[PDB]
Write a protein that binds this DNA or RNA. Structure first.
Ligand SMILES: [Mg+2]
Ligand SMILES: [Zn+2]
Length: 462
RNA sequence: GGUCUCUCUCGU
RNA sequence: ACGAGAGAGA
């Protein structure tokens, strides 16, 4: 992706969008109990911790565009993927506004605890002023779909969250593009059923992990991904995508039966406008972070990308022997013969993608189940039942979370959640965690899950 | 102060 | 089941 122009809001007539500049994060009662080196992300240009210009840092992610149209490797990649999806028989028909707005069995309702985006957010209009759980009223929606129409600009906010110290120094906070509720509704109406299908079928047919539950999914992945594992990280995946990958997406949609009216919406997320503070700017390429379908479209593109890269980098690739699961930019994949990602990465650079060794390795090494990660979790076979696989969230990470809170009122829930993640690392690590938590007065006041009970409940899931 | 998923807690 | 809240992941 790449910024095409920047204009002041006076010149575009777009309402200023301002977001909070102070973090909700505060050190917790456990801050000094556990070691960690993340802090709240820079939210403001005059952050003492800065070492670079904030705004230049923020937008440096739009590295530019290389390809704009599909070459023949990408076309072939598209069609191989699209043919694979066909067996799922996605209903290409349009979802009703009621279901799009209020949800189904395989699609959660539009989040009403969350901004309504442009222009409501600057008009003081929240989602709850237009939508109602109990009424399932769509009447007000319709009136506004007409009043403000579609393709409204995304509202740019900085993400309040913990970042590594190096990232706080270098101003590399992350950005979210709040979608207008109008575009969310319409995108959900156009692709709601695809959403449903993908949520219901995490695995190697969708080539997507959206909808998975790591507690149980982790045991299938070595059966779903037979043979030689490969994986790698992307730097700035979303923003790095060139318009060709959106053309590529269009070809997949067409091939599985979407109308041209439907397919035409892809260009409306390849080419987007955004309001950050007092300015309007244009982005060509780049997945808009907070559009409806972000995770699914990113996963789908990632499936195209991996196929294209394989058949361009190597001779004799049989795409049918590829297995992969993506979650956005995150990937785990397998092939009957080991795939050298150094080479894939070289090819990826010609496509505008920056690919790095899995897990901040210094160089491209072998990926095996013993060191693979996915959704930040490792893979650790249970000692008693080796076919049952623990997702292992590293205690290091968990230590980062517990050292802060956005509201110490919810400490109990927060700690319990961490424990639910922690225990997979085993008894000795888990009790080490627990007794460190007990080492502090609030800690002794918390209900902490018993290990054996966690384990026993885990086994019973199978 | 986005899009989503998963899980937990608390209600009725 | 419906509501509310949280945590984590992408
Ligand atoms: Mg990964
Ligand atoms: Zn534009």
């Amino acid at each position: 992706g790449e910024i095409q122009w920047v204009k002041p809001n006076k010149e575009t007539g777009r309402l200023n969008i301002n977001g909070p500049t102070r973090t909700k994060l505060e050190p917790s009662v456990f801050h000094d109990v556990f070691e960690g080196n993340k802090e709240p992300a820079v939210l403001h240009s005059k952050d003492p911790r800065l070492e670079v210009d904030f705004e230049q840092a923020l937008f440096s992610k739009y590295v530019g565009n290389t390809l704009y149209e599909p070459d023949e490797y990408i076309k072939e990649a598209a069609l191989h993927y699209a043919n694979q999806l066909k067996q799922l028989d996605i209903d290409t028909s349009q979802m009703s506004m009621e279901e799009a707005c209020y949800g189904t069995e395989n699609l959660e309702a539009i989040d009403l605890h969350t901004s309504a985006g442009y222009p409501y957010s600057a008009l003081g209009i929240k989602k709850r002023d237009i939508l109602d759980s109990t009424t399932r009223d769509v009447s007000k929606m319709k009136f506004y779909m007409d009043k403000y129409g579609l393709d409204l600009p995304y509202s740019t906010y900085v993400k309040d969250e913990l970042r590594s110290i190096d990232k706080i120094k270098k101003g590399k906070s992350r950005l979210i593009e709040a979608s207008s509720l109008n575009d969310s509704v319409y995108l959900r109406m156009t692709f709601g059923h695809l959403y449903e299908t993908f949520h219901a079928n995490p695995g190697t047919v969708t080539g997507s992990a959206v909808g998975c539950n790591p507690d149980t999914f982790w045991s299938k992945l070595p059966i779903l991904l037979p043979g030689s594992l490969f994986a790698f990280d992307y730097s700035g995946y979303d923003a790095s995508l060139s318009p060709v990958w959106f053309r590529a997406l269009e070809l997949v949609l067409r091939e599985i039966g979407y109308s041209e009216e439907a397919v035409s919406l892809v260009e409306g997320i390849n080419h987007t406008h955004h309001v950050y503070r007092n300015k309007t700017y244009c982005v060509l390429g780049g997945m808009p972070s907070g559009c409806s379908g972000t995770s699914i479209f990113n996963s789908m593109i990632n499936n195209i990308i991996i196929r294209a890269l394989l058949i361009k980098t190597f001779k004799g690739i049989d795409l049918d022997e590829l297995n992969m699961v993506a979650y956005g930019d995150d990937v785990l994949a397998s092939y009957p013969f080991p795939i050298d990602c150094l080479e894939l990465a070289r090819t990826g650079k010609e496509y505008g993608l920056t690919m790095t060794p899995a897990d901040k390795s210094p160089c491209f090494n072998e990926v095996n189940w013993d060191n693979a990660t996915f959704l930040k979790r490792g893979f650790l076979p249970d000692e008693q039942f080796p076919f049952l696989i623990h997702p292992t969230m590293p205690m290091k990470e968990i230590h980062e979370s517990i050292r802060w809170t956005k509201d110490a009122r919810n400490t109990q829930d927060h700690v319990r959640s961490l424990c639910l993640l922690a225990w997979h690392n085993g008894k000795q690590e888990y009790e080490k965690f627990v007794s460190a938590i007990r080492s502090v007065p609030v800690g002794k006041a918390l209900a902490i899950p018993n290990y054996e009970n966690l384990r026993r409940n885990w086994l019973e899931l199978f």
